[PDB]
Write a protein that binds this ligand. Structure first.
Ligand SMILES: Nc1ncnc2c1ncn2[C@@H]1O[C@H](COP(=O)(O)OP(=O)(O)OP(O)(O)=S)[C@@H](O)[C@H]1O
Ligand SMILES: Nc1ncnc2c1ncn2[C@@H]1O[C@H](COP(=O)(O)OP(=O)(O)O)[C@@H](O)[C@H]1O
Ligand SMILES: [Mg+2]
Ligand SMILES: [Mg+2]
Ligand SMILES: [Zn+2]
Ligand SMILES: [Zn+2]
Lengths: 683, 668, 30, 48
């Protein structure tokens, strides 16, 4: 009493639990209660994760206030101390857990049948205590209360199949959701539910982390469960059940992996964004502990708002540097919000649909989307059209022989200085959900490859991917393309043709998957275009690198009176007001462009005979025209079968932008037009 | 009643269902299941399948039954047994082993056969389910998938030596020399704390005799995942497989295998001093079946695994190294080999989706067939591996031809030239993370032994990296003398290299050697140097454009856009049969034609070394092996000479100067 | 019931005998 | 800064044959003697 003194805190957990139960049972504003609908789904085993919205709790409290009832601030209590309310809400859900309307069959998970077995076993042991005491003949309330004193049942955490998470309350619908930098998360925020805004830099493999290790004793037939809380644990050697503890001949008990409780465990590393780091500082990282069904929701390169419980961990640094009870910290992730939704996770829900129709019905989708790509960049409309086609990409074809065709458009922008090639690269990086901006001859030599290291979390050798690997199923914007090393150039060649990187080096023999669309920006030989010199002469690209690019723009800066007047009005308007000059044309928001492009990428248009015949004729005419000029000062490198597949890819991308399933003549017309005007700036 | 705790498995019901499945299954059930009812032939798909298998295993004395898991889906009564086996492999496989023993005993007794029942009863029969559901890769398995029957597919990189796993511990008394033999129980052996003899009860008298215990074989194999689905941004993964007591040494490095086994997790002790385990479990696979034969892949070269094949017979592992060729399949192979257009049929069957390149696909086919391997009784070795270089104008499908020969070959590694190193292509020293030791791992040229190594961008790889390929392309070996490794390693791998000339275009002004830009010592090692040129011909464009645009008419193309092409399933089996069973022998007329032609070629410009005669012979042998001929006539030598001449385009090359006459090119 | 029975082997494997200890009634599971 | 991990058990299966000398068998037999002993049709020890 004198030691371990008691303190008077304003938190009463009994009525807080009562409020939690009332909210779970009665809240229905989002036909019946939302949360019992969710628990009914969980009981029937269609759902294994319970997400408790703090907006729902806040709305429930507001409604209780409006009707006059005084309700405790459950939202603030959860935000201040979130670890206890996961525990509380789990107990409350267990109390109000509906019976399953679907019977256990052979297609259910082994965990589900194990939980059903132990639930039935504990109810049977309750009934067996009851029958035995009734036979002993010594009110049913007292009989029951004796039974739960003399039963060793499976605790509710062992008969539990769902995972509980706390979704932060929205800023518009409002502490736990305002984004914090890694620096702004001090020790005052420890123990609270907080949201950190950052970029993920390293994700470990999903490993089974034991939470309650189970053992079976062959002597008494008991199952002894030992909870695990730390990095390491000491296994039990002798049984600790009632029978063996009371007896003198103890039983030696063996592990039961199938009966143990495991958690899907990941240890991600979030990092400060460049806009969050102070002046002259290096960004610092934070450890995120992802558990349960939330795993595989974070990947390196993701810019995310991660909401979780900021919790302390035992010290792991040097012992001589420990001054007091120093503790490491991590973020027990509860919710993940992706700034750039991936194209693979696209679903045609109602709101996604309404937005897409409001984009289509406005008309001129192709030109609106192209002109909306970097709208302060002015007068590069064919450039923006080609970039939009690169974002959409063609249709990947796997022939039955096992052959694969790339399906992705590589675009090279060779141009004069000050033409916005680098500004167009960052625009594409911003638009793309998986976009990697690199500069040649910087530090990307290992970037255009993967490096083998050791995972600190899990004792394995894993090769972490670089620029060409992190931008997988995305876009790699390579600036200063003409200034890379030979190894990097060969890697780019392999990526642009086979979409793989074959590495055979000391310690590694692998074929990395790099399904990357390459957007290169280059400067012409001598840094400025010499129209006196041949185009191929001024292009410092091997006929084989040039061949790989589906489109090669020649962005030349020729002086003029009207064109320069119009660029200067645009740039000066952008400098006054942080927006583009045109009032008739409104740019598409980059989030709504990503949603349209995600929708468009789900279509796989095919080519009919009537369109592919023209495609063949155009290819023949292109080949003849290329043959007629091999060195006529306008030679772009003669046409190749790669130009046919680039024409095909551009036509398929244009068909996808129309949300069509037929590759029409208009799309092939526009593809040929884009290829032709890729090179008219020379004239 | 009486199901097993923690499982849905009931011993009686599962045994009855599996016995009914074994006694009453016909392959027409699976043919109906796979929606292939029009392939159903009454002769072999209407016999009890597993009754015949049990009879064959009884006659042959084997102990392992290879159960196709998908077969359980065909039978109605075992639709649940499939899920039980996948979910609970341990209990279900034990019940299946018992049921196999009962089934064979019933087959012997009920049919009143002569076979002795003593050696059947004392034999341990095992079941090897392989074709379980193939999905989820390896990294997408959650902790709920622990102790489940999973199916991985990948490449074998390394294998530890045979580890002894103690099954019976033999103790001995330090006083009275009395011995008990304790049995292992879930990895724990109960050491006696007292001599069980009533005469002496000394407490710590008993000592473990390590060399008199009973041990079993355990082996850990390092595998690289090659999943069907690869999520964006991830890199290739490596896992550890555990093979036990008959599957040890059944997988060699460089093997592409599909392995079915139990997904297990073990706690790893943090330190060797104290007994404290790590809360983060380590995952691995207990191998129960290994499949080394793919129906869309050539069989492994039996000339390289003869010792391994006969060691497999002593080991009674019953691992199918080479696919089975039935009598009907052999008759079909002979009928196809009797065709008049066999050469052009096999050539156009190679990569059907690549446009017409008849000589490139005819050289590729001959390389796949290979020459004749001649071992000297007095000491020596000639290997029929054919090395082919594809130098040519950019965009000619050279890389698609390397990607097909990589996919179709049994073993081989696809390299990119600049991404390869001299150490990388040979054996190197790495560090294991499990044992924390230094181990040897094979290179690309060693993992490709017995197959084809595909090297793209052969020009971009440096001079010193190219030095290691000399010994491989000539002696088919790598004689390595480095710190920790001094030995000769077999590297009997054909080399399929691809390259473009300097300037990335074949300039007709420069001679052939200037364009290829390879040292005479390496350009001689190539048995076939192809100059693939992109000429502008209107009909060539017309037809290459129809070919490419026909692949886009349907979302997943079924390519039959030829007169007739053999399926890869038939093509690989034909090539494997010809390689295994046909060994052409040079005849005297072939010898005279060979000498004639070599002297004719032996008369700047590309040189003709003595190695060209050796490319002739083996090429001729390859042709003689293609037609299933056991002898080489002068027609095969003439075909080899014609292929050699047409590959380098001698018909358009001036003898005095190595210019290619662009008007003389025969693209067609 | 019918009057006949399948011909079962006499030798029981150690694993099959070990599985006999873990049996529970079908009221649990299926 | 974490709490104390708990250890708990639950009966699932019949273990090894109850042996007569086991403290838990002795306790069970004493409990049965207390609850079931009758003297002149009276549970003397239960009532006491
Ligand atoms: N003859 C052909 N048959 C089929 N597809 C072809 C043919 N020629 C070109 N293609 C296609 O056009 C592309 C060029 O083929 P590649 O395999 O890239 O040629 P390559 O010879 O490897 O090119 P380099 O020399 O490495 S630049 C591929 O995507 C093919 O699908
Ligand atoms: N057409 C244009 N519209 C708007 N700004 C432009 C345009 N061309 C160049 N600029 C300006 O030029 C500056 C430098 O362009 P940058 O992309 O860095 O050049 P480059 O791509 O040639 O390396 C940028 O700040 C950009 O705003
Ligand atoms: Mg720039
Ligand atoms: Mg290539
Ligand atoms: Zn016990
Ligand atoms: Zn003794």
């Amino acid at each position: 009493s004198a030691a371990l003194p008691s303190i008077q805190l304003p938190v009463d957990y009994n009525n807080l639990f009562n409020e939690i139960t009332d909210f779970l049972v009665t809240f229905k504003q989002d036909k019946g209660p939302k949360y019992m609908a969710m628990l009914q789904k969980v009981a029937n085993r269609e759902l294994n994760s319970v997400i408790i919205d703090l907006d729902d709790i806040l709305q429930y409290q507001n409604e209780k206030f409006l009707q006059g009832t005084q309700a405790d601030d459950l939202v603030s209590a959860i935000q201040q101390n979130a670890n206890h309310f996961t525990e509380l809400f789990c107990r409350a859900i267990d109390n109000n857990m509906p019976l399953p309307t679907k019977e256990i069959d052979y297609k259910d998970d082994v965990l589900d049948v194990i939980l059903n077995q132990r639930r039935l076993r504990n109810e049977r042991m309750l009934s067996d205590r009851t029958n035995e005491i009734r036979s002993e003949n010594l009110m049913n309330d007292a009989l029951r209360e004796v039974v739960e004193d003399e039963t060793e049942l499976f605790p509710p955490n062992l008969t539990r199949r769902y995972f509980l998470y706390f979704k932060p309350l929205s800023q518009n619908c409002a502490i736990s959701s305002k984004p914090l930098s890694v620096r702004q998360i001090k020790g005052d925020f420890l123990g609270q539910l907080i949201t950190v805004r950052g970029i993920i830099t390293r994700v470990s493999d999903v490993k089974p982390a034991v939470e309650v290790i189970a053992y079976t004793c062959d002597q008494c037939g008991y199952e002894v469960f030992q909870e695990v809380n730390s990095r390491t644990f000491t296994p039990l050697s002798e049984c600790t059940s009632e029978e063996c503890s009371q007896n003198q001949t103890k039983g030696q008990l063996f592990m039961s992996t199938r009966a143990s409780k495991f958690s899907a465990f990941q240890e991600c590393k979030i990092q400060e964004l460049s806009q969050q780091v102070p002046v002259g500082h290096i960004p610092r990282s934070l450890n995120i502990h992802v558990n349960g069904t939330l795993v595989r929701s974070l990947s390196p390169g993701d810019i995310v708002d991660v909401t979780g419980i900021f919790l302390p961990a035992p010290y792991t640094g040097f012992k001589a540097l420990k001054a007091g009870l120093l503790t490491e910290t991590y973020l027990e992730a509860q919710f993940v919000r992706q700034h750039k939704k991936k194209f693979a996770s696209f679903s045609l829900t109602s709101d996604v649909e309404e937005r897409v129709m409001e984009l289509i019905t406005s008309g001129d989708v192709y030109n609106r989307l192209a002109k909306s790509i970097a709208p302060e960049i002015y007068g590069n409309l064919d450039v923006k059209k080609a970039l939009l086609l690169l974002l959409v990409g063609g249709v990947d074809k796997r022939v039955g022989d096992g052959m694969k065709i790339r399906g992705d458009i590589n675009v090279c922008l060779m141009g004069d200085p000050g033409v916005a090639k680098s500004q167009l690269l960052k625009a594409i990086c911003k638009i793309s959900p998986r976009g990697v901006y690199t500069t040649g001859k910087g530090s990307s030599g290992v970037g255009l490859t993967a490096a083998v290291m050791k995972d600190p979390v899990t004792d394995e050798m894993i090769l972490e991917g670089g620029a060409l690997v992190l931008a997988d199923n995305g876009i790699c914007c390579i600036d200063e393309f003409d200034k890379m090393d030979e190894s990097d150039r060969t890697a780019i060649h392999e990526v642009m043709e086979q979409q793989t990187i074959s590495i055979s080096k000391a310690g590694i023999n692998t074929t990395l998957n790099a399904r990357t669309s390459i957007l290169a920006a280059a400067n012409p030989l001598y840094g400025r275009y010499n129209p006196r010199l041949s185009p191929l002469d001024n292009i410092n690209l091997p006929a084989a690198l040039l061949s790989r690019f589906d489109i090669l723009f020649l962005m030349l800066d020729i002086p003029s009176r009207d064109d320069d007047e119009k660029l200067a009005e645009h740039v000066t308007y952008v400098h006054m007001h942080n927006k583009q000059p045109d009032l008739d044309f409104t740019p598409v928001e980059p989030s709504k462009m990503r949603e349209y492009i995600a929708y468009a990428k789900t279509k796989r248009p095919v080519m009919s005979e009537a369109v592919n015949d023209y495609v063949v004729q155009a290819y023949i005419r292109l080949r003849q025209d290329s043959k007629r000029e091999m060195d006529s000062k306008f030679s772009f490198g003669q046409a190749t079968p790669r130009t046919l597949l680039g024409i095909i890819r551009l036509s398929q991308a244009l068909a996808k932008l129309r949300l069509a399933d037929m590759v029409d003549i208009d799309d092939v017309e526009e593809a040929l037009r884009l290829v032709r005007v890729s090179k008219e700036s020379l004239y | 009643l009486r199901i097993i705790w923690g499982t849905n498995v009931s011993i009686q019901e599962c045994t009855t269902n599996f016995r009914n499945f074994l006694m009453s299954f016909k392959y027409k059930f699976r043919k109906i299941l796979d929606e292939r009812e029009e392939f159903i032939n009454n002769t072999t798909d209407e016999e009890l399948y597993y009754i015949k298998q049990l009879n064959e295993m009884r006659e042959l004395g084997t102990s392992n039954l290879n159960l196709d898991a998908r077969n359980l889906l065909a039978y109605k009564q075992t639709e649940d047994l499939y899920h039980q086996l996948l979910n609970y492999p341990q209990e279900v496989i034990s019940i299946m082993d018992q049921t196999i023993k009962d089934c064979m005993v019933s087959l012997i007794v009920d049919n009143n056969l002569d076979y002795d029942l003593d050696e059947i009863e004392t034999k341990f029969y095992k079941v090897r389910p392989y074709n379980v559901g193939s999905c989820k890769g390896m990294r997408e398995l959650n902790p709920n998938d622990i102790d489940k029957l999973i199916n991985l597919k990948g490449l074998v990189l390394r294998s530890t030596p045979v580890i002894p796993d103690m099954k019976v511990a033999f103790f001995k008394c330090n006083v009275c020399d009395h011995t008990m033999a304790v049995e292992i129980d879930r990895g724990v052996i109960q050491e006696p704390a007292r001599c069980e003899r009533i005469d002496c009860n000394e407490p710590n008298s008993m000592s473990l005799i390590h060399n008199r215990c009973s041990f079993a074989d355990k082996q850990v194999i390092k595998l690289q995942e090659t999943p069907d689905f690869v999520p964006d941004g991830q890199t290739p993964h490596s896992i550890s497989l555990c093979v036990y007591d008959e599957l040890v040494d059944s997988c060699r490095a460089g093997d592409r295998i599909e392995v079915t086994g139990t997904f297990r997790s073990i706690p790893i002790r943090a330190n060797s001093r104290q007994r404290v385990l790590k809360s983060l479990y380590k995952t691995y696979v207990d191998v129960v079946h290994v499949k080394k034969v793919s129906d869309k892949r050539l069989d492994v070269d039996t000339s390289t695994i003869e010792q391994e094949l006969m060691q497999n017979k002593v080991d009674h592992n019953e691992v199918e190294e080479v696919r089975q060729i039935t009598d009907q399949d052999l008759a079909k192979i002979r009928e196809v080999a009797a065709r008049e257009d066999l050469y052009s049929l096999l050539a156009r069957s190679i990569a059907p989706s690549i446009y017409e390149l008849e000589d490139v696909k005819k050289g590729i086919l001959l390389q796949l067939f290979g020459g004749t391997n001649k071992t000297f009784t007095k000491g020596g070795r000639y290997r029929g591996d054919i090395n082919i270089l594809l130098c040519g104008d950019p965009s000619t499908s050279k890389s698609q031809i390397l990607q097909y020969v990589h996919k179709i070959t049994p073993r081989g590694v696809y390299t990119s030239g600049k991404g390869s190193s001299a150490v990388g292509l040979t054996a190197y020293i790495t560090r294991d993370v499990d044992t924390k030791q230094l181990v040897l791992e094979s290179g690309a040229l060693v993992l490709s032994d017995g197959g084809v190594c595909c090297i793209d961008e052969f020009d971009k790889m440096s001079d010193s990296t190219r030095s290691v390929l000399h010994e491989v392309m000539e002696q088919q070996t790598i004689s390595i003398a480095k710190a920790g490794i001094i030995t000769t390693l077999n590297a009997r791998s054909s080399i399929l290299a691809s390259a473009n000339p300097i300037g990335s275009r074949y300039n007709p002004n420069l001679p052939v050697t200037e364009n290829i830009d390879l040292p005479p010592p390496l350009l001689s090692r190539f048995d076939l140097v192809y100059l693939v040129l992109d000429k502008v011909d209107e009909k060539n464009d017309r037809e290459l454009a129809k070919h490419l645009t026909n692949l886009y008419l349907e979302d997943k193309p079924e390519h039959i856009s030829q007169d007739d092409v053999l399926p890869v399933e038939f093509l690989t089996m034909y090539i494997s049969y010809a390689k295994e069973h046909i060994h052409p022998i040079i005849t005297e007329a072939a010898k005279t034609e060979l000498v004639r032609a070599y002297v004719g070629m032996r008369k700047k410009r590309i040189t003709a070394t003595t190695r060209q005669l050796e490319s002739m012979i083996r090429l001729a042998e390859a042709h003689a092996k293609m037609k299933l001929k056991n002898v080489v006539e002068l027609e095969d030598v003439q075909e080899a000479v014609r292929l050699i001449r047409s590959a380098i385009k001698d018909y358009a090359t001036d003898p005095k100067t190595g210019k290619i006459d662009m008007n003389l090119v025969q693209t067609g | 019931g019918n009057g006949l029975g399948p011909t079962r082997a006499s030798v029981m494997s150690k694993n099959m005998k070990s599985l006999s200890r873990l049996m529970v009634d079908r009221k649990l599971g299926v | 800064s974490f709490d104390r991990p708990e250890i708990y058990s639950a009966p699932v299966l019949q273990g090894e044959s109850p042996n007569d000398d086991d403290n838990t068998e002795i306790i069970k037999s004493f409990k049965n003697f207390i609850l079931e002993f009758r003297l002149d049709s009276q549970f003397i020890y239960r009532d006491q």
